Amino acid sequence: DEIDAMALYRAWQQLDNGSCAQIRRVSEPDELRDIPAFYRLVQPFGWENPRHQQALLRMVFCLSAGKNVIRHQTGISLGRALANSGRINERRIFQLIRADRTADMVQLRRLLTHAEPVLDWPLMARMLTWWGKRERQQLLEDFVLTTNKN
Amino acid sequence: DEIDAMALYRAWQQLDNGSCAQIRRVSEPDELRDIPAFYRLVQPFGWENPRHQQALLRMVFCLSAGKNVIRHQTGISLGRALANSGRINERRIFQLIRADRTADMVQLRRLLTHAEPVLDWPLMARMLTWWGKRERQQLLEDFVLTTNKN
Amino acid sequence: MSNFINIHVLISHSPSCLNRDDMNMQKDAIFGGKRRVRISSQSLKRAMRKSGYYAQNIGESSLRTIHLAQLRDVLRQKLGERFDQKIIDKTLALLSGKSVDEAEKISADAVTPWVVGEIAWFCEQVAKAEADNLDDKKLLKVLKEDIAAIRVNLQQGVDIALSGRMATSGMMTELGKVDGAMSIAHAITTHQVDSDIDWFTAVDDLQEQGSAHLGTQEFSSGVFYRYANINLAQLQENLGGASREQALEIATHVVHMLATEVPGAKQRTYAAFNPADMVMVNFSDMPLSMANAFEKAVKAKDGFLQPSIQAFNQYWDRVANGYGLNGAAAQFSLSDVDPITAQVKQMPTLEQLKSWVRNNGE
Amino acid sequence: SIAHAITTHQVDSDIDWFTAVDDLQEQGSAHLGTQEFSSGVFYRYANINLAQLQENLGGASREQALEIATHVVHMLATEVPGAKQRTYAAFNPADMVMVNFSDMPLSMANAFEKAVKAKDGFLQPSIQAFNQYWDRVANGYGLNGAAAQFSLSDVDPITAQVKQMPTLEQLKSWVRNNG
Amino acid sequence: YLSKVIIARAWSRDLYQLHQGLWHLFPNDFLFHVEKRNTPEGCHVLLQSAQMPVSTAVATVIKTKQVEFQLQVGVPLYFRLRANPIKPLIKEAEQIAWLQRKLGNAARVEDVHPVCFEGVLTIDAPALIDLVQQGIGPAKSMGCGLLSLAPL
RNA sequence: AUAAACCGCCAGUGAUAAGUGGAAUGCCAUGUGGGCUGUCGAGUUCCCGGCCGGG
DNA sequence: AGACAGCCCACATGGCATTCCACTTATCACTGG
C-alpha cells in the first residue's frame, strides 16, 4: 500500500498557479498542514494514513522547491543527479547529512532549488519516504562516486 | 482531574428553561461570568479551580448556541461535522481559524447555530479546552478532507 | 541644506474597513504588544497616484502592466502618430527584452511601471540608431553615457521617481531602473483595536419566508499614524537633475495627499471621508519616524485623537532633545493641542504649512 | 456613499423585560423576554458623486442629478428604519441638516470622536461639537465651497460662510439650484 | 463627619463585608448609605460617622466634610432617607405612614416617594437634629437608617 | 569450578578566519435582522429590653 | 414561588513574478602485547 509517486508528480504539475504558488511559499514542511490546497492535493495519494503522512510531507516539500526544479526521466539517483548538475559542492551535501531532522529536509530543498536536478522521481520518492541514516549515506556515496566519475 | 464533558452535556440538557434561556442570551463568552445560572451550572464541574474556567466558559458558550444544535453520537470531530452539514462554506471556517480570541469563540458559536452539527461532543469538548493551536489547523484539515471526499 | 523631509500624519477614521486581506478581514498588525489596524503602504501609494489631486497637480500616473500585448497596442496608437510602427515595436522589444510579435498574448517578466513619454524618447533614440545603422548593443553603450536624459522623462511620470522601478529582462535592466525617492510606512492605529463585526442581511424581494443572504464583515474606527520620507537629492536625481524647488513642490503635493487621501474601500458603504487632524513636517539630515511614540498603545481619555497627538508631541520632544536635532519643523492641527518643542512652528492652515515646505522651512 | 450612523455620545443600553400574559393560565406568564434599546443622538453622513450619478443615468444633466440629490437630503433628514417602530415609535425628525458642495468628499464624524458629554441633553452639545469642528476644518483646509445649514436649534452658530435655511424645503430648493 | 468612601471589590461583595470594612476605618457608632455598587473600584459610599475615618487598604476615603447642624423650624428641606420598613412593609401607604411616624413626631413631610425615600419635608429642630444623629429604623449596620438633608 | 579461574586498551589534542537576500506590488465590487409580548403576584425568620425599640 | 418562542436563510469572479549568485587553506600521532 505505497504512494503512487508518478501520479503525485503529475498532480503537482496539474496544479493551478494559485496552489503551485500557495505551496511554494512554505518555509518548513509542517506549514503545509496550514494549507488547504495541500490536503486537497495529497489526500487521494494516501494521506489520512498516519504512517504515510510524514513521507507525503517530504515529497511535497521537495516538489515545493518549485517551480520545476525536479525534472523526471536501473534509474537515476538523487545523489547522481545532484552531482550531474555540477553546481553543488560536496561539503554542502555533508552538511545536509549532519543536520538534524527538519533542518535536513529544509536544506535539501535549498540544494534542489540550486541544482535543478534530473532524477528518476519515483525512486527519489522511495528514498524520500524511507528517509533514514542509510538513505542519507547512500545519498553521499552516489554523490561522491558520481562527482568522481566526472 | 478533567472535566466530565458528557456529564456537563446532560446537565445542560437538564436545565430549566429559565436558566437555559438566561444563558442563551449572552452575546460574548465572558459575559457568562455575570449570570448566576452559569455559576450554578458550572459549579459541580470544577469552575472553582482557575485554568479550568476558561475551558468551561468556552464549552458553555458553545452549548449556548442553543437550543440543541450540538447533537452528540474513532470519534467524530467538529471539522468533520461542519463538513457533514454541507451548509457551511470553507471561507467561514477560515475566518474562524484566523480569528482573534473572543471573536473566534463568537463566530464559532454562529457556525454551530448554522450547521445544527452532528459531532462527538466530548471530543470537540476536549478540543475546546486546549483551543487552540494545532486544534485550529486540525479542524481545517478535517473540514477540507471531509468536504473533498464529497 | 537638509536632505530628508519627514511627513508625520495623525488621521482619525470613523467606522470603516480600509484594507482587507484574502479573507476580507481587516489588515491586522502587532505593535508593540497590541493589535493595531493597518493600512498598507501600497494602498496609500496607489490611493495618492490614482487620486484626482495628483492628476491635477503632478500629471499622469504611470502605466503598470505585465501584459505586453495590450501595451504594444496602446503605444501603437499614441506613438503610432509620432513614430513608425516597426520602430515602436522594436523600442518596446529592447526595453522589455521580450519579443514583440503580433501575437495575441505577450507577457513581461513581472508587472512593471511604464511611462509613455519615456518610451517616446527611447523611440527617438532607436529611430536615430536605426537610420544611422547603429547596432543595438552600441546604442545601449551610448544611452548608458547620459542617464539623466532618460530620467527627465520621469518628470512626465512622477510616481515612479517617488517609489521606484525594478527590471529583470530588458535594456531597461541596464538603464531605466530606479530607487524610490520616497519611502513610506504602512499606517497603523495609535491605540489597541479589537475589530467589530457587522452582521448583515440581503433581503430578497421575491422570497417572503426569509433572507436571501446572511453574512459578517469586519470593521473598525481608528486613529492612524501615517509616516513618509522624501529623500531630496534622490528625487532630484530620479527626475534628471531637477532643482530643490521642483523637489519641494512634489514634496508638498505629497504632504497634501498624505493628509487628505483615503483609500477607496469600502468607502461607498462606510464613508470614512475624514481629513487629517494632525500634520507635522520636519527637515532633517537623517530620516526619522515617530511611530515609537505609540509603542505604548495610547489609552483613550477624551477620545484616542487628543492623547495620540499628545503622545506624539511628547515623544518628538524627547527624541529631538536627546539626539539634539535642530531641523526645521512645522505642525498644523485641527485640535487645540499645542506642541512642546519650540522650534516647531505652528501653522494655522494646511496651505500655510505647504507654502512653508516649498520655501524650504523658510 | 453613505456611512453607518453612529451616536454622537457614549451609550449604555437599557434592557426591557417582556412578559407574555396568557389569558388561559391565571398564575404565571407564558413567556418572559428581553430586548436591548437606547435613546440616542445619531450622526448620519452621505456623499453624492455627481459626475458619477450623471454617468450612471446615461448622461443625465447636472440639474437631474441635483434633483435626485435634494430627494436624498430629504430622505436622510426624514427616514427612520421600521424596526421596532411599532413598539418603540421613534418617529423623530432631524434636528440638524447641513449640505455642502465641495471638490473632495468630507465627513464631519470626527467632530464626535471625543464622545459628546451630556450638558442640557445630548442634542445641544452634539450640535455644538459639529459646528465648532466644522469651523476648524473649514478654516484649516481652506475650502471655499457652497454650504447651507437648516436646524431646529442653533447654539452654536458656525462662522457665516454657511447660508442659514429657516426651513428644510428652502434647503432643498438651495441644493436644486446648486448653491 | 461626612466622608466619601470607596470600598474595594474583594472587600465589598457581601453586606457584612461592607459593615466590617467600614468598621475597620476606626482604630480610635456610625451610619452609611450606598450611592453606587459594583463599580470596578467597588462600592461608592456616603458615610456619616462619629469619628474621622482612616483610609484602609480596602476602604479608601476621598474627602471628609465635618458638619455642625443649623436647623430652623418651618424651613423646607429636600431629604433622602435610605431606610428599611418592617413588621416587611409591602404597601405604599404603609411605607409613607411609617416615615411620617418618626418624622411626623419631629418634622412634617410635604411630599415623598419610594427603601430609598426621596422627598420634601418641613421642620422641632433639636428633635430632628437628634433624630439624624440617631438614625431611623432597622438595619443601621446594613446601610439603612441614613437620612441626608438638603436645602432647597 | 565450564578453551575455565586471575584478567583496564590506555595516555595527549580550539576547527578555525571572511560575508546585505535584495529591488517592484489597492483585495476588490453587492447586502433590513425582521414580525408577537402587563412583571404581575405577595407581607418570611439570628440575640437582649414593655405589637414597639437598640448590633 | 411560578415562567423563559418559533421559522427561515448563509455569494460569486479572477489574479500568484523575474534576475543571479553558491569558498578557499593547513592539517590527519606514537608506544606495548
UniProtKB/Swiss-Prot annotation, chains A, B:
GO biological process, one term: defense response to virus
Up-regulation conditions: Repressed by H-NS, activated by LeuO. Activated by the BaeSR two-component regulatory system, possibly due to envelope stress. Part of the casABCDE-ygbT-ygbF operon.
GO CC annotation terms, alphabetical: protein-containing complex
Keyword Cell wall biogenesis/degradation tagged: no
Matching InterPro entries: CRISPR-assoc_prot_Cse2 (IPR013382), Cse2_sf (IPR038287)
GO MF annotation terms: DNA binding; nucleic acid binding; RNA binding
Pfam families found in the cross-reference section: CRISPR_Cse2
Phenotype of null mutants: Loss of resistance to bacteriophage lambda infection, loss of plasmid silencing. Increased levels of 57 nucleotide crRNA and also 2 and 3 spacer-repeat units.
Keywords for this protein: Antiviral defense, RNA-binding
Family, per entry: Belongs to the CRISPR-associated CasB/Cse2 family.
Quaternary structure, from the entry: Homodimer. Part of the Cascade ribonucleoprotein complex, with stoichiometry CasA(1),CasB(2), CasC(6),CasD(1),CasE(1)-crRNA(1). The CasB homodimer forms a cleft that cradles the 3' end of the crRNA. Interacts directly with crRNA, CasA, CasC and CasE. Stable subcomplexes of CasBCDE-crRNA and CasCDE-crRNA also form, both of which are able to bind target dsDNA. Binding of target ssRNA or dsDNA causes a conformational change in the Cascade complex.
The protein's role, per its UniProt record: CRISPR (clustered regularly interspaced short palindromic repeat), is an adaptive immune system that provides protection against mobile genetic elements (viruses, transposable elements and conjugative plasmids). CRISPR clusters contain sequences complementary to antecedent mobile elements and target invading nucleic acids. CRISPR clusters are transcribed and processed into CRISPR RNA (crRNA).
NCBIfam families: casB_cse2
Protein name: CRISPR system Cascade subunit CasB
Organism of this sequence: Escherichia coli (strain K12)
UniProtKB/Swiss-Prot annotation, chain D:
Induction of synthesis: Repressed by H-NS, activated by LeuO. Activated by the BaeSR two-component regulatory system, possibly due to envelope stress. Part of the casABCDE-ygbT-ygbF operon.
Portion held of the full protein: 183 to 361 of 363
The protein's assembly and partners: Part of the Cascade ribonucleoprotein complex, with stoichiometry CasA(1),CasB(2),CasC(6),CasD(1),CasE(1)-crRNA(1). The 6 CasC subunits make a helical stack forming a groove in which the crRNA lies. Interacts directly with all of the Cas subunits. Stable subcomplexes of CasBCDE-crRNA and CasCDE-crRNA also form, both of which are able to bind target dsDNA, and at least CasCDE is able to form R-loops. CasCDE and CasCE complexes have endonuclease activity. Interacts with YgbT (Cas1). Binding of target ssRNA or dsDNA causes a conformational change in the Cascade complex.
Origin species: Escherichia coli (strain K12)
Protein name (record): CRISPR system Cascade subunit CasC
Phenotype upon loss of function: Loss of resistance to bacteriophage lambda infection, loss of plasmid silencing. Increased levels of 57 nucleotide crRNA and also 2 and 3 spacer-repeat units.
Transmembrane annotation, as ranges: none
From Swiss-Prot, chain E:
Gene Ontology cellular component list: protein-containing complex
Domain of life of the organism encoding this protein: Bacteria
Resulting phenotype, residue 19 to A: Loss of pre-crRNA cleavage
Knockout mutant characteristics: Loss of resistance to bacteriophage lambda infection, loss of plasmid silencing. Decreased levels of crRNA, increased levels of pre-crRNA, prevents pre-crRNA cleavage.
Extent of the signal sequence: none
Enzyme Commission code(s) on record: 3.1.-.-
First-level EC class: hydrolase
UniProt-listed CDD domains: Cas6_I-E
GO terms, molecular function: RNA binding; RNA endonuclease activity
Database matches in SUPFAM superfamilies: CRISPR-associated protein
Induction (free text): Repressed by H-NS, activated by LeuO. Activated by the BaeSR two-component regulatory system, possibly due to envelope stress. Part of the casABCDE-ygbT-ygbF operon.
Keyword match RNA-binding: yes
UniProt keyword annotation of Nuclease present: yes
InterPro entries the UniProt entry points to: CRISPR-assoc_prot_Cse3 (IPR010179)
Keywords: Antiviral defense, Endonuclease, Hydrolase, Nuclease, RNA-binding
UniProt similarity note: Belongs to the CRISPR-associated protein Cas6/Cse3/CasE family. Subtype I-E/Ecoli subfamily.
Quaternary structure note: Part of the Cascade ribonucleoprotein complex, with stoichiometry CasA(1),CasB(2),CasC(6),CasD(1),CasE(1)-crRNA(1). Interacts directly with crRNA, CasA, CasB and CasC. Stable subcomplexes of CasBCDE-crRNA and CasCDE-crRNA also form, both of which are able to bind target dsDNA, and CasCDE is able to form R-loops. CasCDE and CasCE complexes have endonuclease activity. Interacts with YgbT (Cas1). Binding of target ssRNA or dsDNA causes a conformational change in the Cascade complex.
Protein name: CRISPR system Cascade subunit CasE
Source organism: Escherichia coli (strain K12)
This protein's encoding gene: casE
